[PDB]
Every structure is written in structure tokens, then in C-alpha cells.
Amino acid sequence: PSRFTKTRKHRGHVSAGKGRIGKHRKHPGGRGMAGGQHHHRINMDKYHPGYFGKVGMRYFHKQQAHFWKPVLNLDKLWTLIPEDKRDQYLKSASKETAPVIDTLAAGYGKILGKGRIPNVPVIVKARFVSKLAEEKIRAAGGVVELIA
Amino acid sequence: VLKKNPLKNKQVLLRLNPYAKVFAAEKLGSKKAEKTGTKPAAVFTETLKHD
Amino acid sequence: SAQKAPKWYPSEDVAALKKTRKAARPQKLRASLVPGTVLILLAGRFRGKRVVYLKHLEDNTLLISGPFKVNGVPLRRVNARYVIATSTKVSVEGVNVEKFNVEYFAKEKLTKKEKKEAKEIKAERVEDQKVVDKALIAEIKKTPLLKQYLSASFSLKNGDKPHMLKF
Amino acid sequence: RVKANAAKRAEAKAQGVAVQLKRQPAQPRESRIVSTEGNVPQTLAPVPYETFI
Amino acid sequence: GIDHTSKQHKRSGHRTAPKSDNVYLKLLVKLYTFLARRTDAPFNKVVLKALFLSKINRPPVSVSRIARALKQEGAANKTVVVVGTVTDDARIFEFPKTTVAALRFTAGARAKIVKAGGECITLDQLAVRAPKGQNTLILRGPRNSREAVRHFGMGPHKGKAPRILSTGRKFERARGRRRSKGFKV
Amino acid sequence: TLELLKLIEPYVAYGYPSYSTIRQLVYKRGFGKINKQRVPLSDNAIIEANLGKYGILSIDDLIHEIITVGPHFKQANNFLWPFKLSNPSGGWGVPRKFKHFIQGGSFGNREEFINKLVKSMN
RNA sequence: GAAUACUGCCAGCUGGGACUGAGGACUGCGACGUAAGUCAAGGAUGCUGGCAUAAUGGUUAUAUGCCGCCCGUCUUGAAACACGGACCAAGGAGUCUAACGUCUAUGCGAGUGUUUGGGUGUAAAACCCAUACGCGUAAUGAAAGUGAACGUAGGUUGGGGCCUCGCAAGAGGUGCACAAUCGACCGAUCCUGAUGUCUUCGGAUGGAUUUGAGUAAGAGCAUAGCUGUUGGGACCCGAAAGA
RNA sequence: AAAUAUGUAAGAAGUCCUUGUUACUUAAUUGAACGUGGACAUUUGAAUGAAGAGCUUUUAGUGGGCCAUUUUUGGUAAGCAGAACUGGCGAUGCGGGAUGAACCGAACGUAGAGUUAAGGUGCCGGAAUACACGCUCAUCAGACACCACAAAAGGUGUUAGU
RNA sequence: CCCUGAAAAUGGAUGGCGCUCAAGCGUGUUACCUAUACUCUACCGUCAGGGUUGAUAUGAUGCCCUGACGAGUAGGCAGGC
RNA sequence: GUGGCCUAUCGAUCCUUUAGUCCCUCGGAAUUUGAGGCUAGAGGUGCCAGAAAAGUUACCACAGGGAUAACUGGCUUGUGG
């Protein structure tokens, strides 16, 4: 709302807060990123190092769907089981009846290992799994069933 | 609410310093000193008058 | 509504006054003002009149009877700051002035209804004035020229400097 | 000075309490009696100007 | 004239009231103003000052943080106080029975605390049962974990995060960031 | 402190106060610094409330702790607010203040004459 | 042997003049009094007079004493022999938008965002909603890739608040946020290379004056506001030119 | 080989006594660095002050300067051009210097009373045609710093002096 | 100290008048004059530190106590018309 | 002993080229050329934090500048007198 802006407060004061000497002009240093290598060099090199030049190799026609792989840690792994059964599965850890988790159905590509799942065996179906995550699952008594 | 100076307003001067009553009752501000007959030495007098 | 309202109003209960530590002590008159002193009136309708100081009233007013038989000033009160006490003194241990006080000079209760478009002296004052003034005259006549001095009116001459005049 | 301060406090813990460790600035001098006997004051006034060239 | 050693008419720089218009928060501020004045307990003063804080200065406190604070010895029976929001945390699988007093509880946090056998409490009931802050434990959330803090102090060799919109190769990973392209920061 | 005075000499007049000067200064213009505020003394209980740990129970005790530079001089002196003096009643006595007192001016050390100057200044 | 000058002190007495009277029950420090009281002791009372209206006072015109250069602007410096302004009315210049930084408010919070769209409606409103999608909850590397607990999620130093003993002084204990520091973990770089074997694959363990915009009991998402940024006619008006 | 200016230290993050860690170090159970435990008391190790102390984010204007004392370069010099420290003006009125950006005094809410600064007190003009000791007589006297200039040289004018 | 050295152009400047045991020059002692400076008091505002609930006390963004402070272009922010 | 006794003796981005790892990629799957990457040097910007650059205008134009010359005034007075 205009009634709350400093434009209202500047009425009656000549320069509108822009100074009498500097005298607000159109584009005193250039337009956009003009002078990034010449007279804006200090700002560019201090606040945006790495701006100029080429690094790496090109990828013609990159489809981001090829690289689709959401990651899930083991601490959030038990959140995929609905809460109506989470407590029941958490108690009475059975080798003959273990919860089956379809992480792909939950929308995850790779299971990672941020750690400390309870010692309750589970079946974890995943496309990709990290080494430590699979060790931690097998330590808890479960197994990883690779799926596609 | 108002600063009342001592050295006037003997009520305030007596509120502070209760000894001021004894000081007035005995005129300690005008005490007479004991007479002493101790003369200066001749070497002091001669040095003072020396050119 | 043309003006909205004030949400809170001041209380109309008047506040009492804090107890005031100012006591009324008697006025300490000047040294020169002693009974029987001839004063000179500096203000009023009787300006420049030599008068005889007779009594100190309780309202800090001097009861003077500048002898009516001599200069025509009655028994009346004056303010001590509007007189000049002169060195000349007259005896007053033949007169009584204890009757004259504030209630004696209580004037009137004028009414607001009363108004004056264009335009007597109380009885008791005349014999009081005569009785007081008799012994004043008897004392005055003991030494010469007081009657003439009281009759004469004081005034300032050319070059008369009151800051070095001895009264 | 740290070692000396520890030594002073160590002695004061047994005898002579209030050893007053802190340094103090140069204090104003106290009273004294300057004897004249054998030291009679004697000095003259300023001296006249001389060319010395 | 006066030789001013300090700047004149300088505001304290501290909040003396919440910046908000929440009337329930202002009632809480009024209650803890009275308590911070008529009680000498420094708990009421700390709670009162925390009641003035902004959102970024009141980070949420997870139930896992509360459980870790309750693992401290002598603190099992204490009353945890969070001047702010208690959020939920699924990383934990056990929760001790305890009393938590907070401004706001998320639905998950309140459910987890109540399911653990405990109770969620407001700061006014906290004031009623612990007027002097008896056996309380004030918890605060991580303030520098904020994403804005990553970019504070940007400069050469400071090791801070640039203010950037697109991330990846071609976005500020070239001259100035590696020796092979000019220099490195 | 003597080097401090030797360094601000062209801007101050200082000297050796007497008991009468100190007593009249503290009685008439003595204000205490209490909780960062300038409080008129006016009472022994205020001085005892702020200097009672140092054994200073009254204004006379404060005056003695000033005239004789006691152990708690620094605390008593800093408790005293800087005296705000008026201009001297009979003037400074000199045509021009900003010469040394020895050179017919006003600044510097005027050791025993500071009493007459301060008395006229308050 | 005195006096006096000079300088200094008195919690010695006293005369004249001037300005001020703030507060508004009481509380306090006191003083004089055997007490009971009184007072000049945390800010003025008492008495009296005149007028009760243009008298005081306000406004206005004038006079008198003293002072006072024309504003705006650029500028080190303007009353300038610098520029714009004869006068008046009306109009007349930091806006909106896309994206965004810091701060603040609000909702919900490991999530968050209904409004592309569907449903419905008292019909451009209000109300209701699925699946997705964006951002976030994982980083690092050019990339192929790999991907976060040795330990009460570490030790040390401080650290608010809390607990215990304490009348207090203090002493212990616990110590969130935050700061400093030594570690651990993940990715990159360099190195070491176990069992095994399509004998060239695999990469277990162990390291480093290396490196990352990382982990180490999540803080974000959304809307709104001031301020700032960029592109836009871009605060308003203004070329010589080009097509 | 000064003066002025300039670095550091004046303790609790300290000191001392034992004995712990290590892959570094020593011939070594030697050190180095970091520690456990113990001891040091209220002057915890000069003075004065401290107006709260630390810390962080974000953003405006500015990026022509000029003056004075002192130091100082070029120049015959300059109200010239160029540096050093400090104080100012710019951005600032007020009293004084008649007048004046900067000099002296002093920095400013609205009033009252008192006292002063710098500067003054014949009259303009508020305030001594004050007091005291001298000097000067100019047919171009002189009369307050910045500052609105004066020199080499000369005089039985007059005064003091060697 | 005074005099000579000492010449510029409209008429003019110890500020002016004037001033000669000065109203000049050197020095000294006093008295006096007056700034928006200093001291005290009131009022306005700002900042700071505090008091106030056995129903406040009236709405505690209120009432109150205490102390200090106040120049300002460019510019920033606040409260208002 | 990690060039010259010390204090000077030199050079970003893009591009090209070489060396190193014999490593990564050419995205339907392979092999071999070819190409592209990662780490480290060189090829050069002397206006040396680094555009690729001839004049004239008295036929001239615009925005400005007393931030800056040419006439007057002011300061100075070498030179002139």
C-alpha cells in the first residue's frame, strides 16, 4: 500500500532521498551485468566467485527423468508404514512376519543410511541401496529385495 | 522534591551532622589557642635578613 | 456523532491540599517605629502629612492620630511601608488606644445590588477622636513648634536628595 | 615479580598479614626537618649579561 | 555544551513488547510481566524476554531434542519449557513420560507426548503450577541452522554459501573457484 | 595523576582544597551516583546505603574520606558526581583566562588560591 | 610589650533589593519541648484593597528602540556583477509488474502450498476437493558414481536457566541456544591394496600440513508488509542522431 | 644523537606441587604440549574512567572538498600548486573581531533569575571623561592578534642607558 | 617614542565623530557591561532505570516515580496531519 | 639446499596446445578412430585486473562545463617601469 511507503514521507524534501550531489540518474554504472569483468569486478569476485568461464563437459539433450532417484534414510524408513500398524510391528519383532516396505511405491529411488532403526526385521524393497544401509537392515534382522 | 541547601536552613544542617549543635554550643569555630613563647633562632633571623 | 468520544474521562473529584508548613509569626517592625513617633505619610489622600504614631494593630497596620485638631487627620490605620519615621518623638503615656482595633475599623458590608449614579461620619468616632486628641495636644504644647510642624506638609525641594536626607 | 608476589604472600600467610601486593605510583613526600647546622643557606641573585665573543 | 562520551538518546536495542497483535500472546506477556516483577526468580524474566522474540529467534524444538534433554541426570522429573513451538520427530521410537509447557504443539508432537503418558501444557498453567519456575528446564532450538545464516559473511576464504538461484555445473563453479580457471577464492 | 594534570593544564584550574572548601562543596553541591543516576545527598541514609560497606555512614564521613585520602578514596570520589559549579561571583580576577596563573591568566596550578576561586564559583 | 595591615576560618549575628511558589490527604529525615504537642523538618501561606469590565488579556493597524540582503539550485564558497522565477488558478514527477535479498507478522509444520483444473453456488464472490507439481527434508563430483553414529550423536573451555546444601557469601551438580577448539562421519583428490577371480575385475581395511555451498535428534513451505536489487518508458521532462 | 609520536607487558585463559597422555622429542623414566588431583582470599597482583558490554544482519548518502596553527615540496611569488598531524568550515546558529564560511569565546528545546567568556566601558553604545607611573607633539602622529604590509639606511627631536 | 626614507589614479575611512598630563603608546590595580556558554527553577519532548492486582485500576500500547539529555546539510527511521 | 646474498626483472576469462591419470563421457547396446572432460604447464594482453580500431571539419551538430582555456577584475611581480 502506497500510504505506508517512504515516497509519502519524502514529499516536500527536494531530492526524494537520492541526494543533491549524486543526483539520481538513469543507469550510472550500466545496465544489468554490464562491466562484470571491468568495473564490477570486485563485487563479482567477492560475492560470486566462479561466475566467469567454463567447467565440465556438456550433455546434449539431457532428460532429468533419467536421473530420477529420491533418497530415503533409514531413520525415516519406518515412516512409510502407516501409524495404525507401526506400533504393532514395532513390538513383537517376528522373523516369520515382517513388514514389507515398497519404497518405490512410496516414491524413493535409493535407500541411504543415516542410521538407528530398531532391531525389528523388515523387508525393504528398493531399486538402489547404500552399503551401510543394507548392513544396518541386515543387522536389525531384515533383508533388501531389489526391485525394478 | 526540592533541594534545601545546608549552611542555611539550620533545620537541614541539623538533620545532617548532629555534631553541629555541639559545635554551636561550644563556639568551636572560634577557639582560642594556647599562647606559646617559642622564639625563632638567630641563624634563621639572620638568614632571612641576609641580602 | 461529530466527535467520536473520549474512552476515558478525568475524575471530577477535587483533590485535597497537602498540609502546608507555613506558620503565622508576628511581624517584626522596624527599629525607628516606636509609639509617639512623628511619621510622614507617603501615599493616600493624606499624602505628605506629619502624623503621630500611636499603636501597632494586629493586622500589621499602624494606628495613627495625626492630630485632627492640628492637621485634620482622624484616628486611622496606615501601612508601615508607606510612611517615613522621623526622629521627632512625642509622649503617649497619657492616652489609651486599646479600644481601637480591627473590629473597631471594620467598615461595612456593601451590597452588590447597590450602585451609585452620581453620589455621614459615625457618632462614636468623634468623641473617641476628641478624647484621644486632648492629651496629645497637652503633650505637644510642652515643647514649642510641634503644632506648626504637624500643620505643615512635607514636600521635596529642588536638589533634595532623600538618599542622604536624615528624617 | 610473580615469583616475588608468591613469596610475599607465602610469608604473610604465616606472619605479618595484609602484605599489600599491588604496586603503587610515586606518592607525595612526607614531612621532614631540614637542619641548617653546617648547611647555612647562601646564594646570590641572577647574573649580568656578558658578551663572551 | 557537554563533551558527549556516548551517543545521546540511544534506544536499548532490545524488544520490550512482542511485535505481534496476538491478544492471547499479549495476555501471556501481561501475566509474565507481573510474575517477573513480583517474583525474584530469574525464570520469569527469561520467559518474559523470550515472549518478545521474533520467529527466527524462536526456532522450533523437536520432541527428540526434548528426549535428549531428559536423558540428563537429575532431569527425569523436570518440566521442559519451550517458549515457541514443539515440532514432531519420527527419528525417535521411544518417548519418556514427561510434562512439556510450550506456546504451540504441532499435532504430531502433541500426539506423541500424550501417547507417551505425558501432558502438553500452556505457559499460563506453567505459571500456575510453577510460579517461581520450580524444577523447570528451558530449551531452545538451533538458531544458526537457518538457511539464511549460510550466506552470512560471504567473502573470499570465508567458506560461506553464495546467494544463488540455480545450482549445478555452469553456476559459479569456474574462475575464482578452482585453480585451473584463474584462481581459487 | 600529576602527569594527567600536567597534560590538561591549559584547560583547567586546580589547586589544593581546604577543609572549609571541601565541606561547603559537598554540603551544597554534593550529588551521588546511584544506579547511574545523579541523586542529591540530602540525607545520611543514602550515603550509608551506597558507601556503608566502606564504613562511610554520613556526609562528614565522606568529607573526611576526601580531605584525608583514605583507603576508600577512589570509591567515595567516584560515588560523588562531578560538581557542577557556577561562574565565579566576582569574576575570574584577570583580563584573560587562558594564560597560566603564573603569567597573569587563570589556568594551571594556583595551589592555595583554588579555595577562593571555588568559593566564588559555588 | 601591644595595636594594626594582609591572608584565612566560624556548623557568628543581622539589614536592603530581585526572580521563583513547581507538588497537592498521610507516610520520611529531623529539630524544640519530661511527655502532650509544636515547627522555618520530602516545593506558599495568611491578611487586605480596587474592579467585575474592554480594566487585564487576545487579534489587528500604526509608531518607537534594536535587529533582519531573495528564494530555489549547483557549489569549497551565493545577497551575488551565477542560473530559474512578472502575477494567479488548475494540472504537474520513485509508479505497477516478473523474479529476488535482509528483516517482521501470520498459518501449519518434516512438511508445506485449495483457486491448472473439478465440484458447488445467493454466480467474476463464498464454500469444498483428487492426482500431480514446486520448494523443502542429502551431499559431493566435470562425470561415471558413491553417499552421512566408534562413542548416553564425542572430548575440552565458557555459558542463561534449573537442582541440592546454604540465612547470606558461596559451593557443588545439570548444563539448551551460542562462541572457540580437538576429534568422528559423507563426497572429491592423492595414497595403501585383504579374502576372492571371466588373471583383470573387485575394493576390505588403513591413512592425509589436501578439498566441499556437507553430517553430527531436521526448519521449512505459503501468504502479507516496509526497505533494497535487476529487467521493464521505470521518478518527471530534454538531444545531436539511426531506421 | 634528542623532543614529539610508536610496540608490548602489568596474571584466574594466572602461579606453584605431585603425577597422567602421546605415534612427537631425548642417551634416558629427557623435554614439548595438553591434563587429573591439591594450594594460593576479596588489594585476582599500577592509576583514572567505563556513559551498559559483546555480537550479527541489512541498507542510505558520499567517493569535486576547502581553511587555520605547526612540519613540509615545487615556484621569484601567489587569495598558487602539492603532502603530514591536529582542530575546524562544509553541515552552524549565537557573543566578539564595524563588515567576513573558517579567527577568538562558546555550540543551540521553551522561559525566568543570577554569573561570566571573548571583547569592551568619551559619544554613537550597555559599561570608570576610573586610579597610578612614565613616554610621544607628527606643515603626510598614533590608536589592538588573524588583518587588510613595509625595508635597507639616516636625525645635537626627546627620554632612558653603556 | 617621534621624524626622514614613504609616489596612483571617483571623494573617504583607527567603523564614525572626534581625541594631545589622550579618547595615543608601555605597564599595573580595581570597578562595571553583556552570549543561545555556566548555576538554580518551571515547562515540552526524547532516552534510560523503576513502582502499580488477596480485584488491579480501571482497559497495565494506562497511571505514576527518578535521573540525564536536546545543533544539524546529504541521509536513515519513528509518530502524526 | 624447494634457483640466483637481500630489495625489481612480469600476465585472467574464451580459444589452441602439451604433460598426467590411462581415468570419466559421446545418453538404444558395443569395438576402433575422432571429439569432449578432470589435474598441471605454455601461446598474451607493456593502456601491464588484460576492447579488435586512422584522420579532418572555418560547413559543422548536441549535452554540458566557469570542474577548463581565450578578453576584464582579483592575488603575485620573475619580466617591464
Ligand SMILES: C[C@@H]1C[C@@H]([C@H](O)CC2CC(=O)NC(=O)C2)C(=O)[C@@H](C)C1
Ligand atoms: C593472442 C592469442 C589469443 C589470446 C586470447 O585467446 C584472445 C581472446 C579471444 C577472444 O575472443 N576472447 C578472449 O577471452 C581472449 C591468448 O590467450 C594468447 C595467449 C594468444
Ligand SMILES: [K+]
Ligand atoms: K543542551
Ligand SMILES: [K+]
Ligand atoms: K568522423
Ligand SMILES: [Mg+2]
Ligand atoms: Mg521546492
Ligand SMILES: [Mg+2]
Ligand atoms: Mg535513499
Ligand SMILES: [Mg+2]
Ligand atoms: Mg537534484
Ligand SMILES: [Mg+2]
Ligand atoms: Mg579495461
Ligand SMILES: [Mg+2]
Ligand atoms: Mg556584579
Ligand SMILES: [Mg+2]
Ligand atoms: Mg540592520
Ligand SMILES: [Mg+2]
Ligand atoms: Mg541562494
Ligand SMILES: [Mg+2]
Ligand atoms: Mg560580486
Ligand SMILES: [Mg+2]
Ligand atoms: Mg547552468
Ligand SMILES: [Mg+2]
Ligand atoms: Mg528571468
Ligand SMILES: [Mg+2]
Ligand atoms: Mg514560468
Ligand SMILES: [Mg+2]
Ligand atoms: Mg495542484
Ligand SMILES: [Mg+2]
Ligand atoms: Mg504524483
